[PDB]
Amino acid sequence: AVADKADNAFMMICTALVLFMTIPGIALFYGGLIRGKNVLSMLTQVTVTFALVCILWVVYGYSLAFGEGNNFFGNINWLMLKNIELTAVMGSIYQYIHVAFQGSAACITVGLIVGALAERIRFSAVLIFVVVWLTLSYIPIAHMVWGGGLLASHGALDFAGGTVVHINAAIAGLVGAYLIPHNLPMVFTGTAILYIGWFGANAGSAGTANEIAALAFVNTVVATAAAILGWIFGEWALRGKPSLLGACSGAIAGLVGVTPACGYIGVGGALIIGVVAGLAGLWGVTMDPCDVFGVHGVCGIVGCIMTGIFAASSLGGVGFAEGVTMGHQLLVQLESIAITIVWSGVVAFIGYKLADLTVGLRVP
Amino acid sequence: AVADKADNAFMMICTALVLFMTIPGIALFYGGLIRGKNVLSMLTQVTVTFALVCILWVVYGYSLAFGEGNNFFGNINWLMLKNIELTAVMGSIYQYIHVAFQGSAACITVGLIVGALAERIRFSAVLIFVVVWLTLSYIPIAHMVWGGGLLASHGALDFAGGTVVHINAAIAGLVGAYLIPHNLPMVFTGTAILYIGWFGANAGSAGTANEIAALAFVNTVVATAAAILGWIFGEWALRGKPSLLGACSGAIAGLVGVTPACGYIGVGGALIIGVVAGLAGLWGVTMDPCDVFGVHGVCGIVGCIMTGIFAASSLGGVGFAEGVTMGHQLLVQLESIAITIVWSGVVAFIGYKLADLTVGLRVP
Amino acid sequence: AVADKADNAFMMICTALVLFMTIPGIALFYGGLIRGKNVLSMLTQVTVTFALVCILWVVYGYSLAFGEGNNFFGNINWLMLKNIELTAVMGSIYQYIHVAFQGSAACITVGLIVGALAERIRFSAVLIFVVVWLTLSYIPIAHMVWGGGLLASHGALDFAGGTVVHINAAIAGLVGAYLIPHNLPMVFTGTAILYIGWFGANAGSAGTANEIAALAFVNTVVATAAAILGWIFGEWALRGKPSLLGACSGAIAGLVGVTPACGYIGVGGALIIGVVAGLAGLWGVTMDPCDVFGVHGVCGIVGCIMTGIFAASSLGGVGFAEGVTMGHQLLVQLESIAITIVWSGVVAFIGYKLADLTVGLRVP
Numbered sequence A, B, C: 001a002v003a004d005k006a007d008n009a010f011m012m013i014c015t016a017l018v019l020f021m022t023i024p025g026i027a028l029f030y031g032g033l034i035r036g037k038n039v040l041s042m043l044t045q046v047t048v049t050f051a052l053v054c055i056l057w058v059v060y061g062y063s064l065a066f067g068e069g070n071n072f073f074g075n076i077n078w079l080m081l082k083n084i085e086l087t088a089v090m091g092s093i094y095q096y097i098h099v100a101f102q103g104s105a106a107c108i109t110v111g112l113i114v115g116a117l118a119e120r121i122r123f124s125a126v127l128i129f130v131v132v133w134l135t136l137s138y139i140p141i142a143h144m145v146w147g148g149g150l151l152a153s154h155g156a157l158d159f160a161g162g163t164v165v166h167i168n169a170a171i172a173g174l175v176g177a178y179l180i181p182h183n184l185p186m187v188f189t190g191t192a193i194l195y196i197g198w199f200g201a202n203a204g205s206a207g208t209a210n211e212i213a214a215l216a217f218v219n220t221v222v223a224t225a226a227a228i229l230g231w232i233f234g235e236w237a238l239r240g241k242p243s244l245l246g247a248c249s250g251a252i253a254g255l256v257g258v259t260p261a262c263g264y265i266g267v268g269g270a271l272i273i274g275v276v277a278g279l280a281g282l283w284g285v286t287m288d289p290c291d292v293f294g295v296h297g298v299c300g301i302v303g304c305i306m307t308g309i310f311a312a313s314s315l316g317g318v319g320f321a322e323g324v325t326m327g328h329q330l331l332v333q334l335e336s337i338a339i340t341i342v343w344s345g346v347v348a349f350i351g352y353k354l355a356d357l358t359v360g361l362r363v364p
Helices: A005-033 A036-066 A095-117 A123-146 A162-179 A184-204 A211-239 A244-258 A267-286 A289-310 A326-358 B005-033 B036-066 B095-117 B123-146 B162-179 B184-204 B211-239 B244-258 B267-286 B289-310 B326-358 C005-033 C036-066 C095-117 C123-146 C162-179 C184-204 C211-239 C244-258 C267-286 C289-310 C326-358
Strands: none
Touching (some): A005 A036, A005 A184, A005 C184, A036 C184, A036 C267, A095 A184, A095 A289, A123 A326, A162 A289, A162 A326, A184 A211, A184 B036, A211 A244, A211 A267, A211 B036, A244 A289, A244 B036, A267 A289, A267 B036, A289 A326, B005 B095, B005 B184, B005 C005, B036 B095, B036 B123, B095 B123, B095 B162, B095 B184, B184 B244, B211 B267, B211 C005, B211 C036, B244 B267, B244 C036, B267 B289, B267 C036, C005 C036, C005 C095, C005 C184, C036 C095, C036 C123, C095 C123, C095 C162, C123 C162, C123 C326, C162 C289, C267 C289, C289 C326
């Protein structure tokens, strides 16, 4: 296997785009939402835990998530990336690029949690939680879905992280809230940067600048647009008028919904997933810190289920694997969702409780 | 024809850059200019009509603009992109990428109009106008210039949309104004994002990461810089001192001027076009909602004419087509400008009037 | 030599990223720091001198920096890029792209100076200084380090501009200060854009999307993260609590430290350089306009020295050149630092004094 320089180029730019989602994307999104007196502290916590995730990732995170191990975790053979030669190829790109790309996905997941809870949580407590939860939740779930583990081996479809990123972080946020907008142009700016960066996430999940990356790119455009319109219509119906936060939340709803699906569906399915995600998102926030689950959880679940529908050739998808019915695939999607929810929840509980027993959760 | 993965990579990143121009680029630019009480509504309208354009584009927009039809429009064979196979190649890239790239150009055009007029126009009215004008103005003009239609067949030179994007949207904005800055750091931020995104527009118009993309890239840098300096000097001459809005408007003036020309001229012509566009822009705003025509119209016309001059090998350009004199080419540029102006104006009038007859134009 | 389209694509996107660092990156960073009454003027000066650098670069800057001449400067053979054919290849990319990439590095260097001093300096004076200093400092130093001149021929290691960009601009800023935060979310936004853009600077310095670009990318992620954590820990130790400006300054400290090193070291060295740069940065600002030298100077020196250590195969680096000991290489790094400091200082003194003798330095 020789690295393709076009794929190298594409994947490095895609990684920069995903990093852009956290720094400053998610930080600006939460920054406009939370109380003004908490903005600077939140921005600090997002920046510092971003740094921490990057370092934990290189030290042992990548090895435990993407090394060959068992159904649940990898190994400790790639500590500080030892035993990975610089010219080592993974797929069609240098493995180093796969390290950086996968690391940037861990970063956005943690940014979603920290941004939402920074208001309510002590600094030292969030650092402890991050270490526990990144190590015992994100890493095993990344391994199970993308590292050849339990879920991948049963044929779970999750292109860019409906489970690993969105459901995963939404449950940690929900456990957080349970245990513990002044600048709308800022929220919009955050949303926009999130949208643009997300193309690196969705298309880059192909691992190559091929027709699947192209598909995921177009689907991302279609599903985000459909979700904005879906949310806004429901908002006009329920509330009498659209709002900027509505439009922005709609965009995020479509982006989340299409994340597990983008590389498997036709543009028709993307339009349908978008509309359903936008509406489900609006229902979610109507019926949870900064509506993390309300959108990332609900729309993550919706998207992961609908992938099991719209991957069908019949519906314009790339097709299920050989010998797989829609019936069987839907069940596998449901099982993957359930596993992610319980795994994240249990680990998150452990994380917050360890923090609470050590330094105390609630901010003095 | 097989897709080149380097071109795939380049074109997908260029499309993300052009989307970045609208979301949040143009929105932030207008956001700093308009009255504070109108900012949130404008940002909502730009986001929602952005979503609408994306969807109309996939449903039928691309097919009617880039399908084979007549001199004026394509066909309805690529509805929801039906009959385009995933692995279908257009030029040296997957056709799906050409869909996304061309869609992002439609989006920035509509963003230029909506951002400027959102203050004055009712929400439902702008949605109706967008549908009419995207369908009957942007699509036929994109087809005439870039889809093998009337203007392309007579040899019109317009690399990245001096007519299709800038003159087109400037006339719609001017008809709009006729019928119907509190945050300068925000305007600057919008301008900057517009500048960076524009490289995807200008260089990506090559359809490939070749020496023409490289040329258009350098020309974009040169012409923007020359236009900033030209505007600022004229401002110092006329007003006694430069201003931030002046500098920013200068940048936009150069970017617009070089849009039709970037892929056809030498760096010497780029410098000359930049200076002339910057000065013409300043004259334009001195002698129109948020100066849409003042800069996009004037500098679009200036750039489209000057392309007919500086494409000459004599002047460092790539050369006119075989059998074409500068005399003949200039006439073709003038005719393309005239056609765009009258086509956009007539359709825009129809659009606003339909909106006015249906829901009423003026915001209650 | 034929151009590789993947490298063309990668290098054009990397150039856009580096331009993004100045416009709006550095402008927003200084914008949040300086007094509110000075923000608009500063943003204007950064924009106008950015335009000026771009134009001076094309007219003669690139030719004098990268043309073949002597140990100190190139030639005047590539005036307005004359004698460079469009299809001319430099390395594995079109030479035009090398022009744009190298130009964008000159731009960020000047942006670092102008942003810091715009408060204190008259508009006409900064324009004169820029012309003198770009011409007599940046150009010869770029030639000496990257254009086959004095320092490159003695084997100086400087991958992405620890000397050419950071030490160079830090000394000009320090001479400036000697002769002559209201928006922290803005500073953070500036910092973030600086971080994302810097990947184009560091990885693009490979000139190709290969394993060295991949290395420099990962090292950039590691060193920035380590520097944030290093600064924050020292801040918690010295001041009792982290701060947003601390976190942001830490990020910049790591980015600067790793700039000369990124393409030569292992991830272990990147982690060590990051921590040491973050701490040295904090010492620097504790023990100078907008702490330009405090971070860019101190961390530039630290990074340039440490490159001479961690390039060793023994320490996970790519290895010293044949026949070079760590002892000999460290000396060459020290000599390169010393030369840059004295060269920049002397030229900067000349520049400011010429400005002072012509229009007067201090702003009326």
